[PDB]
Design a protein around this ligand. Structure first.
Ligand SMILES: NC(=O)c1ccc[n+]([C@@H]2O[C@H](COP(=O)([O-])OP(=O)(O)OC[C@H]3O[C@@H](n4cnc5c(N)ncnc54)[C@H](OP(=O)(O)O)[C@@H]3O)[C@@H](O)[C@H]2O)c1
Ligand SMILES: NC(=O)c1ccc[n+]([C@@H]2O[C@H](COP(=O)([O-])OP(=O)(O)OC[C@H]3O[C@@H](n4cnc5c(N)ncnc54)[C@H](OP(=O)(O)O)[C@@H]3O)[C@@H](O)[C@H]2O)c1
Ligand code: NA
Ligand code: NA
Lengths: 370, 370
């Protein structure tokens, strides 16, 4: 199978390339690498010689592929995909971008949750497979066990989203902001006798100052938060908040009887893990031990963290999870509202299960089943 | 009125002293300053000469006061308060500490919400007035308008709590952690061609390394979060999470018909503002304009931020709120679960309304009404 890689050089793409090298995915395919800025120079060598970088916008080049895996983004998909399909291309389009998620001809791919749906699509002629929004995917990797048993009546999701979700430059800005904060008070920090109110005054001044690097975020992220992600929608939701409901219900095949999913999506000063605090209304009073088992046994990556203080602090954090495929979920307990209310807190890496991982896994499923 | 100040030198105390200087509170009282480490040296001059620092543990000194305002902490109150009352002291005890909050002889003081309760207490012989938990106070300052009309059926609160809540040393640690993160990748940050994955790898390594300053938190806060605050309780709540329900219902005088309040309390890398994402179940379908008006008109400090993207990013953040008495609340909208579900996101300064402000205000109310 001849497979085109688009957007391989960027952040999501680079994570994908690393994982494909680790799992030796290139042994299984004839890779063809594409570019927008380096067309015609030698392609990267990830174990296999793929020749030259091809033109990402050249429909005649793309047409010759059996599949495309693209991490290039929505603008690219909007330009290229319709032209490709119109040209009669029947190849597999595997996409990180949100563009085609809600298209009737596309399946949102998160195989530990919806493998059967993916297999059914492959059998019955589906050629477009799209990764879900990072938040949706990470939530379902954590709570798949509850959703598959149809136990969720509704869910409120308050998120703690890392800078990586906004982009590589936003991550860089976060770290730079951290540096500027510390620089402003490094002297008083080194002095044990210094006043916390003096330190605080300078930190606040610095974060507000013109010189504080805010070109990407518009406002500080380090030392703060931003309770709005993506464009506004008519009902008052941000696009990020809206994605959860429509995408999860499509993945789960519940579009005829959708689970209400809503909440506030908040950007915090984490590097590359998204965390979520969930109020989960269940249809039945189910004992906590049974809930924990249902959750734990759903997939190989979810990890139930015992509701104890010290283990939570060590395990249920971005610092622990970053750069790993582990999806810990903890603080599992019934809430004051009733024994059909379940509290959960989960953390997952935004670039792995939230981006790159479903793409490479979908490739392997297609290879086995086509 | 002869008023003792205990814990005036610490973080909360220092904020209190600043506010008392700003509002010229010392004109109204004969201040007597106490100490544990500098007994017998000249007291601070905040406009008035108060003589020498007295022994904070000397019951014979405390007995001579008409009132005590203490920011010293729970350990101090546990040691001193029972002995003071047993000695027949009938003075006013105004306390930042959690110790006496749930005692039947004490009123939790948050006058923009419960002035009438405070006045009734003063009239009928209450001598102990205690500030509520920072999270509870800040939530009620935002949502007082809804709670006073008895419209809240239940509320789920997912918090974003600043380092200041844990203490001055924890704030210092947060900033130091930020510095260490930036130091590790400052070179690659200055290089536009550097790889985000290389930067990420080093940041992750650094946060995990032994040398990362974590003596106070135990784990990283900068670049991460900690979804556990304070000791575990039997039902699986942390003490911080438990405080919300019992304290809010006492403030509101609803102990006979309590509103269920629960959620997860999370420490994030903010300096001194606590933020909260709330799922509020209302008893009635009330139009959003009416909800906004009810909220906005409750008190002088709550600020309804329009549910628009750019204004939210500028106004509804720790960076905006820090060091001010403003309590913005935004993202006000009906949720997917139904028109009796209300989403709200609020930010408030932890040291002002969450600590120092109710103490000085209670002093003034007592002076007027006694
Ligand atoms: N302005 C922005 O912040 C912006 C821009 C792009 C994407 N995005 C978002 O990010 C998602 C795409 O994932 P991503 O974050 O992985 O995209 P990304 O990092 O921006 O990479 C996408 C493409 O940009 C090119 N690129 C430009 N400068 C680069 C650099 N310094 N290092 C590596 N590649 C560079 C590369 O294509 P070539 O090899 O052909 O040069 C790469 O394949 C999209 O869904 C989109 O929403 C935002
Ligand atoms: N180990 C801890 O992290 C610890 C310690 C204390 C309080 N707390 C918590 O914090 C709350 C009290 O508020 P807070 O945070 O304002 O307390 P704080 O900053 O620790 O100040 C409380 C007292 O500690 C003394 N102190 C010791 N070192 C100091 C320093 N370097 N600068 C100024 N004062 C110093 C002061 O008393 P003197 O003037 O008599 O020396 C001060 O009044 C309590 O509710 C408690 O839970 C925690
Ligand atoms: Na700036
Ligand atoms: Na350490």
């Amino acid at each position: 199978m001849r497979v085109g890689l688009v957007g391989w050089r960027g952040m999501v793409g680079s994570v994908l390339m690393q994982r494909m090298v680790e799992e030796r995915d290139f042994d299984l395919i004839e890779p063809v690498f594409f570019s927008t800025s380096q067309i015609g120079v030698p392609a990267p060598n990830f174990g296999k010689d793929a020749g030259m970088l091809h033109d990402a916008f050249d429909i005649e080049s793309l047409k010759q592929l059996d599949a495309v895996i693209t991490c290039q983004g929505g603008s690219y998909t909007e330009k290229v995909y319709p032209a490709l399909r119109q040209a009669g291309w029947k190849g597999y389009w595997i996409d990180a971008a949100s563009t085609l998620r809600m298209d009737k001809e596309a399946i949102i791919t998160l195989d530990p949750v919806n493998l059967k749906q993916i297999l059914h699509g492959i059998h019955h002629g589906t050629k477009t497979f799209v990764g879900g929004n990072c938040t949706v995917s990470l939530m379902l990797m954590a709570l798949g066990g509850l959703y598959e048993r149809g136990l969720v009546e509704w869910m409120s999701a308050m998120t703690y989203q890392a800078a990586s979700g906004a982009g590589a430059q936003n991550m860089r800005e976060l770290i730079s902001q951290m540096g500027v904060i510390n620089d402003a008070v490094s002297s008083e920090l080194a002095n044990p006798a210094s006043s916390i109110l003096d330190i605080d005054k300078k930190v606040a001044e610095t974060m507000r100052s013109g010189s504080f690097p805010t070109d990407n975020f518009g406002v500080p992220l380090a030392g703060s938060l931003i309770p709005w992600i993506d464009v506004k929608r008519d009902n008052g939701q941000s696009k990020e908040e809206w994605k959860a409901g429509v995408e999860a219900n499509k993945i789960l095949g519940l579009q005829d009887s959708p689970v209400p999913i809503d909440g506030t999506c908040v950007r915090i000063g984490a590097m590359r893990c998204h965390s979520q605090a969930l109020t989960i209304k269940l249809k039945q009073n189910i004992p906590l031990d049974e809930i924990e088992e249902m959750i734990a046994t759903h997939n190989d990556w979810v990890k139930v963290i015992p509701n104890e203080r010290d283990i939570t602090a060590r395990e249920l954090t971005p610092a622990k999870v970053t750069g790993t495929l582990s999806v810990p979920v903890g603080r599992l307990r019934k809430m004051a509202m009733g024994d059909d209310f379940l509290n959960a807190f989960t953390v997952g890496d935004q670039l792995l299960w939230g981006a790159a991982e479903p793409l490479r896994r979908t490739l392997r499923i297609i290879l086995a089943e086509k």
